[PDB]
Amino acid sequence: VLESKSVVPGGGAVEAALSIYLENYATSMGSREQLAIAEFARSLLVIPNTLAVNAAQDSTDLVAKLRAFHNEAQVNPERKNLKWIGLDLSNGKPRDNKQAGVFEPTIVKVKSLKFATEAAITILRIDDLIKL
Amino acid sequence: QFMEETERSLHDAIMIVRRAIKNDSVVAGGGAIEMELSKYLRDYSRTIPGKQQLLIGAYAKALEIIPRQLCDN
């Protein structure tokens, strides 16, 4: 909070929006890469899941319900009905900000985003491993 | 061996020409509508779920496979 007053509302409310936000960004891309966005949005969805899983919660009935919080896609307490906001851990469900509402420092995710995207593709790089 | 499917093309036309007659309302062929219907559900894949987007994501996609079968085959 103190070294970064820049932080995103929600840590987990992003995922549902993001997929949709990507699903939106997907559909216009067309070709294969409409889907290359979609499967990129499918990588997103574990974030509520392992949470709900480690919390012994049902992941779908949250992240789906999450994806049903919207008019357009944003994380914000003003519209939790018409937009996403926040998250919970033990129940797992979205909160607002001062509710339980989760945040993220905007620094960390983009880096985590950046890394997995890049490690996977170099993992996606090679087809061989040879030895003698 | 090439002579037969013309007649099958003739009747198949005759069928859906008569079927364009036996149904006044005739929409776009080649799986044109299903794609929108998928997104129409991808709407609900966003809009509907407490859960069932899992369905609405699954269900709708299967539409697009039939004209996909064409580009495929």
Side-chain angles (χ1 to χ4, degrees), chain A residues 20-107:
Chain A
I20 288 135
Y21 168 78
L22 268 60
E23 177 183 0
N24 298 339
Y25 172 72
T27 308
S28 296
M29 180 64 181
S31 296
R32 297 178 183 177
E33 293 78 359
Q34 177 169 349
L35 175 59
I37 296 159
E39 290 303 321
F40 188 79
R42 302 298 168 270
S43 304
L44 297 170
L45 300 174
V46 65
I47 303 313
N49 297 340
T50 177
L51 172 59
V53 173
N54 297 341
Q57 298 297 320
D58 291 345
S59 301
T60 61
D61 297 345
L62 275 59
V63 63
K65 175 183 59 60
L66 279 173
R67 291 180 63 184
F69 299 107
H70 60 280
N71 183 30
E72 296 305 319
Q74 175 60 57
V75 183
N76 55 345
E78 55 183 340
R79 299 175 180 176
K80 66 190 183 73
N81 52 32
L82 296 172
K83 267 84 183 179
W84 287 269
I85 187 46
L87 193 67
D88 186 359
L89 298 178
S90 294
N91 188 341
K93 296 182 175 72
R95 306 289 175 266
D96 293 347
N97 287 338
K98 182 56 178 169
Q99 179 180 353
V102 179
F103 292 80
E104 180 64 18
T106 307
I107 57 197

Coordinates of all heavy atoms in Angstrom, one line a residue, chain A residues 20-107:
Chain A
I20 N -13.7 -12.8 -19.6 CA -14.6 -11.9 -20.4 C -13.9 -10.8 -21.1 O -14.0 -10.6 -22.3 CB -15.7 -11.4 -19.4 CG1 -16.6 -12.6 -19.1 CG2 -16.5 -10.3 -20.1 CD1 -17.0 -12.7 -17.6
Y21 N -13.2 -9.9 -20.3 CA -12.4 -8.8 -20.9 C -11.6 -9.4 -22.1 O -11.4 -8.7 -23.1 CB -11.6 -8.2 -19.8 CG -10.5 -7.3 -20.4 CD1 -10.8 -6.0 -20.8 CD2 -9.2 -7.7 -20.4 CE1 -9.8 -5.2 -21.3 CE2 -8.2 -6.9 -20.9 CZ -8.5 -5.6 -21.3 OH -7.5 -4.8 -21.8
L22 N -11.0 -10.6 -21.9 CA -10.4 -11.2 -23.0 C -11.4 -11.8 -24.0 O -11.2 -11.6 -25.2 CB -9.4 -12.3 -22.5 CG -8.0 -11.9 -22.3 CD1 -7.9 -10.7 -21.3 CD2 -7.2 -13.0 -21.8
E23 N -12.4 -12.5 -23.5 CA -13.5 -13.0 -24.3 C -14.0 -11.9 -25.2 O -14.2 -12.1 -26.4 CB -14.6 -13.5 -23.5 CG -15.9 -14.0 -24.2 CD -16.9 -14.4 -23.2 OE1 -16.7 -14.4 -22.0 OE2 -18.0 -14.8 -23.7
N24 N -14.2 -10.7 -24.7 CA -14.5 -9.5 -25.5 C -13.3 -9.3 -26.5 O -13.5 -9.4 -27.7 CB -14.6 -8.3 -24.6 CG -15.8 -8.4 -23.7 OD1 -16.7 -9.2 -23.9 ND2 -15.7 -7.6 -22.6
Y25 N -12.1 -9.0 -26.0 CA -10.9 -8.9 -26.8 C -10.7 -10.1 -27.7 O -10.2 -9.9 -28.8 CB -9.7 -8.6 -25.9 CG -8.4 -8.6 -26.5 CD1 -8.0 -7.6 -27.4 CD2 -7.5 -9.6 -26.3 CE1 -6.7 -7.5 -27.9 CE2 -6.2 -9.6 -26.8 CZ -5.8 -8.6 -27.7 OH -4.6 -8.6 -28.2
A26 N -11.1 -11.3 -27.3 CA -11.0 -12.4 -28.2 C -11.8 -12.3 -29.4 O -11.3 -12.3 -30.5 CB -11.5 -13.7 -27.4
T27 N -13.2 -12.1 -29.3 CA -14.1 -12.3 -30.4 C -13.7 -11.4 -31.6 O -13.9 -11.9 -32.8 CB -15.5 -12.0 -30.0 OG1 -15.8 -12.7 -28.8 CG2 -16.5 -12.4 -31.0
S28 N -13.1 -10.3 -31.4 CA -12.8 -9.4 -32.5 C -11.5 -9.8 -33.2 O -11.3 -9.5 -34.4 CB -12.7 -7.9 -32.0 OG -13.9 -7.5 -31.5
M29 N -10.7 -10.5 -32.5 CA -9.4 -10.9 -33.1 C -9.6 -11.9 -34.2 O -8.8 -11.9 -35.2 CB -8.5 -11.5 -32.0 CG -7.1 -12.0 -32.5 SD -6.2 -10.6 -33.1 CE -4.7 -11.4 -33.6
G30 N -10.6 -12.7 -34.1 CA -10.9 -13.7 -35.1 C -9.8 -14.7 -35.4 O -8.8 -14.8 -34.6
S31 N -9.9 -15.4 -36.5 CA -8.9 -16.3 -37.0 C -8.7 -17.4 -35.9 O -9.6 -17.9 -35.2 CB -7.6 -15.6 -37.4 OG -7.9 -14.8 -38.5
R32 N -7.4 -17.8 -35.7 CA -7.1 -18.7 -34.6 C -7.0 -17.9 -33.3 O -7.2 -18.4 -32.2 CB -5.8 -19.4 -34.8 CG -5.8 -20.4 -36.0 CD -4.5 -21.0 -36.2 NE -4.4 -21.8 -37.4 CZ -3.3 -22.5 -37.8 NH1 -2.2 -22.3 -37.1 NH2 -3.3 -23.2 -38.9
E33 N -6.6 -16.6 -33.4 CA -6.1 -15.9 -32.2 C -7.3 -15.3 -31.5 O -7.0 -14.8 -30.3 CB -5.1 -14.9 -32.7 CG -3.8 -15.5 -33.2 CD -4.0 -16.1 -34.7 OE1 -5.1 -16.0 -35.2 OE2 -3.0 -16.6 -35.2
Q34 N -8.5 -15.2 -32.0 CA -9.6 -15.1 -31.2 C -9.6 -16.2 -30.1 O -9.8 -15.9 -28.9 CB -10.9 -15.2 -32.0 CG -12.2 -15.2 -31.2 CD -13.4 -15.1 -32.1 OE1 -13.3 -14.8 -33.3 NE2 -14.6 -15.3 -31.5
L35 N -9.3 -17.4 -30.5 CA -9.2 -18.5 -29.5 C -7.9 -18.4 -28.7 O -7.8 -18.7 -27.5 CB -9.3 -19.8 -30.2 CG -9.1 -21.0 -29.3 CD1 -10.1 -21.0 -28.2 CD2 -9.4 -22.2 -30.2
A36 N -6.8 -18.1 -29.4 CA -5.5 -17.9 -28.7 C -5.6 -16.9 -27.5 O -4.9 -17.0 -26.5 CB -4.4 -17.5 -29.6
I37 N -6.6 -16.0 -27.6 CA -6.9 -15.1 -26.5 C -7.8 -15.9 -25.5 O -7.6 -15.8 -24.3 CB -7.7 -13.9 -27.0 CG1 -6.7 -13.0 -27.8 CG2 -8.2 -13.1 -25.8 CD1 -7.5 -12.1 -28.7
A38 N -8.7 -16.7 -26.0 CA -9.6 -17.5 -25.1 C -8.9 -18.5 -24.3 O -9.0 -18.5 -23.1 CB -10.7 -18.2 -26.0
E39 N -8.0 -19.3 -24.9 CA -7.2 -20.2 -24.1 C -6.3 -19.5 -23.2 O -5.9 -20.0 -22.1 CB -6.5 -21.2 -25.0 CG -7.4 -22.2 -25.6 CD -8.2 -23.0 -24.6 OE1 -7.7 -23.3 -23.6 OE2 -9.4 -23.2 -24.9
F40 N -5.9 -18.3 -23.6 CA -5.1 -17.5 -22.7 C -6.0 -17.0 -21.5 O -5.6 -16.9 -20.4 CB -4.5 -16.2 -23.4 CG -3.6 -15.4 -22.6 CD1 -2.3 -15.8 -22.4 CD2 -4.0 -14.2 -22.0 CE1 -1.4 -15.1 -21.6 CE2 -3.2 -13.5 -21.2 CZ -1.9 -13.9 -21.0
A41 N -7.3 -16.9 -21.8 CA -8.2 -16.5 -20.7 C -8.6 -17.8 -19.9 O -9.2 -17.7 -18.8 CB -9.5 -15.9 -21.3
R42 N -8.4 -19.0 -20.5 CA -8.6 -20.2 -19.8 C -7.5 -20.5 -18.8 O -7.8 -21.2 -17.8 CB -8.8 -21.4 -20.8 CG -9.9 -21.1 -21.7 CD -11.2 -20.9 -20.9 NE -12.2 -20.3 -21.7 CZ -12.5 -19.0 -21.8 NH1 -11.7 -18.2 -21.2 NH2 -13.4 -18.6 -22.6
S43 N -6.3 -20.0 -19.0 CA -5.3 -20.1 -18.0 C -5.6 -19.3 -16.8 O -5.2 -19.7 -15.7 CB -4.0 -19.6 -18.6 OG -3.7 -20.4 -19.8
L44 N -6.3 -18.2 -16.9 CA -6.7 -17.3 -15.8 C -7.5 -18.1 -14.7 O -7.3 -17.7 -13.5 CB -7.6 -16.2 -16.3 CG -7.0 -15.2 -17.3 CD1 -8.1 -14.4 -17.9 CD2 -6.0 -14.4 -16.6
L45 N -8.3 -19.1 -15.1 CA -9.4 -19.4 -14.2 C -9.0 -20.3 -13.0 O -9.9 -20.5 -12.2 CB -10.4 -20.2 -15.1 CG -10.8 -19.2 -16.3 CD1 -11.7 -19.9 -17.3 CD2 -11.5 -18.0 -15.7
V46 N -7.8 -20.7 -12.9 CA -7.4 -21.5 -11.8 C -7.3 -20.7 -10.5 O -7.3 -21.2 -9.4 CB -6.1 -22.2 -12.1 CG1 -5.0 -21.2 -12.2 CG2 -5.8 -23.3 -11.0
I47 N -7.2 -19.4 -10.6 CA -7.0 -18.5 -9.5 C -8.0 -18.6 -8.4 O -7.7 -18.8 -7.3 CB -6.7 -17.1 -10.0 CG1 -5.6 -17.0 -11.0 CG2 -6.5 -16.1 -8.8 CD1 -4.3 -17.8 -10.5
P48 N -9.3 -18.5 -8.7 CA -10.3 -18.8 -7.7 C -10.4 -20.3 -7.4 O -10.8 -20.7 -6.3 CB -11.7 -18.4 -8.4 CG -11.2 -17.4 -9.4 CD -10.0 -17.9 -9.9
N49 N -9.8 -21.2 -8.3 CA -10.0 -22.6 -8.2 C -9.2 -23.2 -7.0 O -9.7 -23.6 -6.0 CB -9.8 -23.3 -9.5 CG -10.7 -22.8 -10.6 OD1 -11.8 -22.3 -10.3 ND2 -10.3 -23.0 -11.8
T50 N -7.9 -23.2 -7.2 CA -7.0 -23.6 -6.2 C -7.3 -22.9 -4.9 O -7.2 -23.6 -3.8 CB -5.5 -23.3 -6.6 OG1 -4.6 -23.7 -5.5 CG2 -5.3 -21.9 -6.9
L51 N -7.7 -21.7 -4.9 CA -8.2 -21.0 -3.7 C -9.4 -21.8 -3.2 O -9.3 -22.3 -2.0 CB -8.6 -19.6 -4.0 CG -9.3 -18.9 -2.9 CD1 -8.4 -18.9 -1.6 CD2 -9.7 -17.5 -3.3
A52 N -10.5 -21.9 -3.9 CA -11.6 -22.6 -3.5 C -11.3 -24.1 -3.2 O -11.8 -24.7 -2.2 CB -12.7 -22.6 -4.6
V53 N -10.3 -24.7 -3.9 CA -9.9 -26.0 -3.7 C -9.2 -26.1 -2.3 O -9.5 -26.9 -1.5 CB -9.0 -26.6 -4.8 CG1 -8.4 -27.9 -4.4 CG2 -9.8 -26.7 -6.1
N54 N -8.2 -25.2 -2.1 CA -7.5 -25.2 -0.8 C -8.4 -24.8 0.3 O -8.2 -25.2 1.5 CB -6.3 -24.3 -0.9 CG -5.3 -24.7 -1.9 OD1 -5.2 -25.9 -2.3 ND2 -4.4 -23.8 -2.3
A55 N -9.4 -24.0 0.0 CA -10.4 -23.6 1.0 C -11.6 -24.7 1.1 O -12.5 -24.5 1.8 CB -11.0 -22.3 0.7
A56 N -11.4 -25.8 0.3 CA -12.5 -26.8 0.2 C -13.8 -26.1 -0.2 O -14.8 -26.4 0.4 CB -12.6 -27.5 1.5
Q57 N -13.7 -25.3 -1.2 CA -14.9 -24.6 -1.8 C -15.1 -25.0 -3.2 O -14.2 -25.5 -3.9 CB -14.7 -23.1 -1.7 CG -14.5 -22.5 -0.3 CD -15.8 -22.7 0.5 OE1 -16.9 -22.6 0.0 NE2 -15.6 -23.0 1.8
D58 N -16.3 -24.9 -3.7 CA -16.6 -25.2 -5.1 C -16.2 -24.0 -6.0 O -16.8 -23.0 -5.9 CB -18.1 -25.5 -5.2 CG -18.5 -26.8 -4.6 OD1 -17.6 -27.6 -4.2 OD2 -19.7 -27.0 -4.4
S59 N -15.2 -24.3 -6.8 CA -14.6 -23.3 -7.6 C -15.5 -22.7 -8.7 O -15.6 -21.5 -8.8 CB -13.3 -23.8 -8.2 OG -12.4 -24.3 -7.2
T60 N -16.2 -23.6 -9.4 CA -17.0 -23.2 -10.5 C -18.1 -22.2 -10.0 O -18.3 -21.1 -10.5 CB -17.6 -24.4 -11.2 OG1 -18.4 -25.1 -10.2 CG2 -16.5 -25.3 -11.6
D61 N -18.9 -22.7 -9.0 CA -20.1 -21.9 -8.6 C -19.7 -20.5 -8.1 O -20.5 -19.7 -7.8 CB -20.8 -22.7 -7.5 CG -21.3 -24.0 -8.1 OD1 -21.4 -24.2 -9.3 OD2 -21.7 -24.9 -7.3
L62 N -18.4 -20.3 -7.9 CA -17.9 -19.0 -7.6 C -17.4 -18.3 -8.9 O -18.0 -17.3 -9.3 CB -16.7 -19.1 -6.6 CG -17.0 -19.1 -5.1 CD1 -17.9 -20.3 -4.8 CD2 -15.7 -19.2 -4.3
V63 N -16.4 -18.8 -9.5 CA -15.8 -18.1 -10.7 C -16.9 -17.9 -11.8 O -16.9 -16.9 -12.5 CB -14.6 -18.9 -11.3 CG1 -15.0 -20.3 -11.7 CG2 -14.0 -18.2 -12.4
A64 N -17.8 -18.9 -11.9 CA -19.0 -18.7 -12.8 C -19.9 -17.6 -12.3 O -20.1 -16.6 -13.0 CB -19.8 -20.0 -12.9
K65 N -20.4 -17.7 -11.0 CA -21.0 -16.6 -10.4 C -20.2 -15.3 -10.5 O -20.8 -14.2 -10.8 CB -21.3 -16.9 -8.9 CG -21.9 -15.8 -8.1 CD -22.0 -16.2 -6.7 CE -20.7 -16.6 -6.1 NZ -19.7 -15.5 -6.2
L66 N -18.9 -15.4 -10.3 CA -18.0 -14.2 -10.6 C -18.2 -13.7 -12.0 O -18.6 -12.6 -12.2 CB -16.6 -14.6 -10.4 CG -16.0 -14.6 -8.9 CD1 -14.6 -15.2 -8.9 CD2 -16.0 -13.2 -8.5
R67 N -18.1 -14.6 -13.0 CA -18.3 -14.2 -14.4 C -19.7 -13.6 -14.6 O -19.9 -12.9 -15.6 CB -18.0 -15.3 -15.3 CG -16.5 -15.7 -15.4 CD -16.2 -16.8 -16.4 NE -16.5 -16.4 -17.7 CZ -16.4 -17.2 -18.8 NH1 -16.0 -18.5 -18.6 NH2 -16.7 -16.8 -20.0
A68 N -20.6 -13.8 -13.7 CA -21.9 -13.3 -13.9 C -22.1 -11.9 -13.1 O -23.2 -11.4 -13.1 CB -23.0 -14.2 -13.4
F69 N -21.0 -11.4 -12.5 CA -21.1 -10.1 -12.0 C -20.5 -9.1 -13.0 O -19.3 -9.0 -13.2 CB -20.2 -9.9 -10.7 CG -20.7 -10.8 -9.6 CD1 -19.9 -11.9 -9.2 CD2 -21.8 -10.4 -8.8 CE1 -20.3 -12.7 -8.2 CE2 -22.2 -11.2 -7.8 CZ -21.4 -12.3 -7.4
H70 N -21.4 -8.4 -13.7 CA -21.0 -7.5 -14.8 C -22.2 -6.8 -15.4 O -23.3 -7.3 -15.3 CB -20.3 -8.3 -15.9 CG -21.3 -9.3 -16.5 ND1 -21.5 -10.5 -15.9 CD2 -22.1 -9.2 -17.5 CE1 -22.4 -11.2 -16.6 NE2 -22.8 -10.4 -17.6
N71 N -21.9 -5.7 -16.0 CA -22.6 -5.1 -17.1 C -21.6 -5.0 -18.2 O -21.8 -5.6 -19.2 CB -23.2 -3.7 -16.7 CG -24.1 -3.1 -17.7 OD1 -24.7 -3.8 -18.5 ND2 -24.1 -1.8 -17.8
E72 N -20.6 -4.1 -18.0 CA -19.3 -4.3 -18.6 C -18.4 -4.8 -17.5 O -18.8 -5.1 -16.4 CB -18.8 -3.0 -19.1 CG -19.6 -2.5 -20.3 CD -19.8 -3.5 -21.4 OE1 -18.8 -4.2 -21.7 OE2 -20.9 -3.6 -21.9
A73 N -17.1 -5.0 -17.8 CA -16.2 -5.7 -17.0 C -15.3 -4.7 -16.2 O -14.5 -4.0 -16.8 CB -15.3 -6.7 -17.8
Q74 N -15.5 -4.6 -14.9 CA -14.6 -3.9 -14.1 C -14.6 -4.4 -12.6 O -15.6 -5.0 -12.2 CB -14.9 -2.4 -14.1 CG -14.1 -1.5 -13.1 CD -12.6 -1.5 -13.4 OE1 -12.2 -1.2 -14.5 NE2 -11.9 -1.9 -12.3
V75 N -13.5 -4.2 -11.9 CA -13.5 -4.6 -10.5 C -13.6 -3.3 -9.7 O -12.8 -2.4 -9.8 CB -12.2 -5.3 -10.2 CG1 -12.2 -5.8 -8.7 CG2 -12.1 -6.6 -11.1
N76 N -14.7 -3.2 -8.9 CA -15.1 -2.0 -8.3 C -16.3 -2.2 -7.4 O -17.3 -2.9 -7.9 CB -15.4 -0.9 -9.3 CG -16.5 -1.4 -10.3 OD1 -16.7 -2.6 -10.4 ND2 -17.0 -0.4 -11.1
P77 N -16.4 -1.7 -6.2 CA -17.5 -1.9 -5.3 C -18.8 -1.2 -5.6 O -19.8 -1.6 -5.3 CB -16.9 -1.4 -3.9 CG -15.9 -0.4 -4.3 CD -15.3 -0.9 -5.6
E78 N -18.6 0.0 -6.3 CA -19.8 0.7 -6.8 C -20.8 -0.2 -7.5 O -22.0 -0.2 -7.2 CB -19.4 1.8 -7.7 CG -18.5 1.4 -8.9 CD -18.0 2.5 -9.7 OE1 -18.6 3.6 -9.7 OE2 -17.0 2.4 -10.4
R79 N -20.3 -1.0 -8.5 CA -21.1 -2.1 -9.0 C -20.4 -3.4 -8.7 O -19.4 -3.8 -9.4 CB -21.2 -1.9 -10.5 CG -22.0 -0.6 -10.9 CD -22.1 -0.3 -12.3 NE -22.8 0.9 -12.6 CZ -22.9 1.5 -13.8 NH1 -22.4 0.9 -14.9 NH2 -23.6 2.6 -14.0
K80 N -20.9 -4.1 -7.7 CA -20.6 -5.6 -7.6 C -21.6 -6.4 -8.4 O -21.3 -7.4 -8.9 CB -20.6 -6.0 -6.1 CG -21.9 -5.9 -5.3 CD -21.6 -6.1 -3.9 CE -22.9 -6.1 -3.0 NZ -23.7 -7.3 -3.2
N81 N -22.8 -5.8 -8.5 CA -23.9 -6.4 -9.3 C -23.6 -6.2 -10.8 O -23.5 -7.2 -11.6 CB -25.2 -5.8 -8.9 CG -25.2 -4.3 -8.9 OD1 -24.5 -3.6 -9.7 ND2 -26.0 -3.7 -8.0
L82 N -23.3 -5.0 -11.2 CA -23.0 -4.7 -12.6 C -21.6 -4.7 -13.0 O -21.3 -4.5 -14.1 CB -23.6 -3.3 -12.9 CG -25.1 -3.0 -12.9 CD1 -25.4 -1.6 -13.0 CD2 -25.9 -3.9 -13.9
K83 N -20.7 -5.0 -12.0 CA -19.2 -5.2 -12.3 C -18.7 -6.0 -11.2 O -19.3 -6.3 -10.2 CB -18.5 -3.9 -12.4 CG -18.3 -3.2 -13.8 CD -19.4 -2.3 -14.2 CE -19.2 -1.8 -15.6 NZ -20.3 -0.9 -16.0
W84 N -17.4 -6.5 -11.4 CA -16.8 -7.3 -10.4 C -16.3 -6.4 -9.3 O -16.2 -5.2 -9.4 CB -15.6 -8.1 -11.0 CG -16.1 -9.2 -11.8 CD1 -16.3 -10.5 -11.3 CD2 -16.5 -9.2 -13.2 NE1 -16.8 -11.3 -12.3 CE2 -16.9 -10.5 -13.5 CE3 -16.5 -8.3 -14.2 CZ2 -17.3 -10.9 -14.7 CZ3 -16.9 -8.6 -15.4 CH2 -17.3 -9.9 -15.7
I85 N -16.0 -7.0 -8.1 CA -15.2 -6.4 -7.1 C -14.6 -7.5 -6.2 O -15.3 -8.5 -5.9 CB -15.9 -5.3 -6.4 CG1 -15.0 -4.6 -5.4 CG2 -17.1 -5.9 -5.6 CD1 -13.7 -4.2 -6.0
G86 N -13.4 -7.3 -5.7 CA -12.9 -8.0 -4.5 C -12.9 -9.5 -4.5 O -13.2 -10.1 -5.6
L87 N -12.6 -10.1 -3.4 CA -12.6 -11.6 -3.3 C -12.6 -12.0 -1.8 O -12.4 -11.2 -0.9 CB -11.4 -12.2 -4.0 CG -11.5 -13.7 -4.3 CD1 -12.6 -13.9 -5.2 CD2 -10.2 -14.3 -4.8
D88 N -13.0 -13.2 -1.6 CA -12.8 -13.9 -0.3 C -11.9 -15.1 -0.5 O -11.6 -15.5 -1.6 CB -14.2 -14.3 0.3 CG -14.1 -14.9 1.7 OD1 -12.9 -15.0 2.2 OD2 -15.1 -15.3 2.2
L89 N -11.4 -15.6 0.7 CA -10.5 -16.8 0.7 C -11.3 -18.0 1.2 O -11.5 -19.0 0.5 CB -9.3 -16.5 1.6 CG -8.3 -15.4 1.1 CD1 -7.2 -15.3 2.1 CD2 -7.8 -15.7 -0.3
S90 N -11.7 -18.0 2.5 CA -12.3 -19.2 3.1 C -13.6 -19.5 2.4 O -13.8 -20.7 2.0 CB -12.6 -19.0 4.6 OG -11.3 -18.9 5.3
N91 N -14.5 -18.6 2.2 CA -15.7 -18.8 1.3 C -15.2 -18.7 -0.1 O -15.6 -19.5 -1.0 CB -16.8 -17.8 1.6 CG -18.1 -18.1 0.9 OD1 -18.1 -18.9 -0.1 ND2 -19.2 -17.5 1.4
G92 N -14.3 -17.8 -0.4 CA -13.8 -17.6 -1.7 C -14.5 -16.6 -2.6 O -13.9 -16.2 -3.6
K93 N -15.7 -16.2 -2.3 CA -16.5 -15.4 -3.1 C -16.0 -13.9 -3.2 O -15.3 -13.5 -2.3 CB -18.0 -15.4 -2.6 CG -18.5 -16.8 -2.7 CD -19.9 -16.9 -2.2 CE -20.5 -18.3 -2.4 NZ -19.9 -19.3 -1.5
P94 N -16.5 -13.1 -4.1 CA -16.0 -11.8 -4.2 C -16.5 -10.9 -3.0 O -17.6 -11.2 -2.5 CB -16.7 -11.3 -5.5 CG -17.9 -12.1 -5.7 CD -17.4 -13.5 -5.2
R95 N -15.7 -10.0 -2.7 CA -16.0 -9.0 -1.6 C -15.8 -7.6 -2.3 O -15.7 -7.5 -3.5 CB -15.1 -9.2 -0.4 CG -15.2 -10.7 0.1 CD -16.6 -10.9 0.7 NE -16.8 -12.3 1.1 CZ -17.3 -13.2 0.3 NH1 -17.8 -12.8 -0.9 NH2 -17.4 -14.5 0.6
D96 N -15.8 -6.6 -1.5 CA -15.6 -5.3 -2.2 C -14.2 -4.8 -2.1 O -13.3 -5.2 -2.9 CB -16.6 -4.2 -1.7 CG -18.0 -4.6 -2.0 OD1 -18.3 -5.5 -2.8 OD2 -18.9 -3.9 -1.4
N97 N -13.9 -4.0 -1.1 CA -12.6 -3.5 -0.9 C -12.4 -3.5 0.6 O -11.5 -4.3 1.1 CB -12.5 -2.0 -1.4 CG -12.4 -1.9 -2.9 OD1 -12.1 -2.9 -3.5 ND2 -12.8 -0.8 -3.4
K98 N -13.2 -2.8 1.3 CA -13.3 -2.7 2.8 C -14.3 -3.8 3.3 O -14.6 -3.8 4.4 CB -13.6 -1.3 3.2 CG -13.6 -1.1 4.7 CD -12.3 -1.5 5.4 CE -12.4 -1.2 6.8 NZ -11.2 -1.8 7.5
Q99 N -14.8 -4.6 2.3 CA -15.7 -5.6 2.8 C -15.0 -6.8 3.4 O -14.8 -6.9 4.6 CB -16.5 -6.1 1.6 CG -17.6 -7.2 1.9 CD -18.3 -7.6 0.7 OE1 -18.2 -7.0 -0.4 NE2 -19.1 -8.7 0.8
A100 N -14.5 -7.8 2.6 CA -13.3 -8.4 2.8 C -12.3 -8.0 1.7 O -11.1 -8.4 1.7 CB -13.4 -10.0 2.8
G101 N -12.8 -7.1 0.9 CA -12.4 -7.1 -0.5 C -11.0 -7.1 -0.8 O -10.2 -6.2 -0.4
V102 N -10.6 -8.1 -1.5 CA -9.2 -8.4 -1.8 C -8.7 -7.3 -2.8 O -9.5 -6.5 -3.3 CB -9.0 -9.8 -2.4 CG1 -7.5 -10.1 -2.8 CG2 -9.4 -10.8 -1.4
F103 N -7.4 -7.1 -2.8 CA -6.7 -6.3 -3.8 C -5.6 -7.0 -4.4 O -5.3 -8.1 -4.0 CB -6.2 -5.0 -3.2 CG -7.3 -4.0 -2.8 CD1 -7.9 -4.2 -1.6 CD2 -7.7 -3.0 -3.6 CE1 -8.9 -3.4 -1.1 CE2 -8.7 -2.1 -3.1 CZ -9.3 -2.3 -1.9
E104 N -4.9 -6.4 -5.3 CA -3.5 -6.7 -5.6 C -2.7 -5.5 -5.9 O -3.2 -4.5 -6.5 CB -3.4 -7.7 -6.8 CG -2.0 -8.1 -7.1 CD -1.3 -8.8 -6.0 OE1 -2.1 -9.4 -5.2 OE2 -0.1 -8.9 -6.0
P105 N -1.5 -5.4 -5.4 CA -0.6 -4.4 -5.9 C -0.3 -4.7 -7.4 O 0.0 -5.8 -7.8 CB 0.7 -4.6 -5.1 CG 0.2 -5.2 -3.8 CD -0.9 -6.1 -4.2
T106 N -0.6 -3.6 -8.2 CA -0.6 -3.8 -9.6 C 0.7 -4.3 -10.2 O 0.8 -4.7 -11.3 CB -1.1 -2.5 -10.2 OG1 -2.3 -2.1 -9.6 CG2 -1.3 -2.6 -11.7
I107 N 1.8 -4.3 -9.3 CA 3.1 -4.6 -9.8 C 3.2 -6.1 -10.0 O 3.8 -6.6 -10.9 CB 4.1 -4.1 -8.8 CG1 3.8 -4.6 -7.4 CG2 4.1 -2.6 -8.8 CD1 4.5 -3.8 -6.2

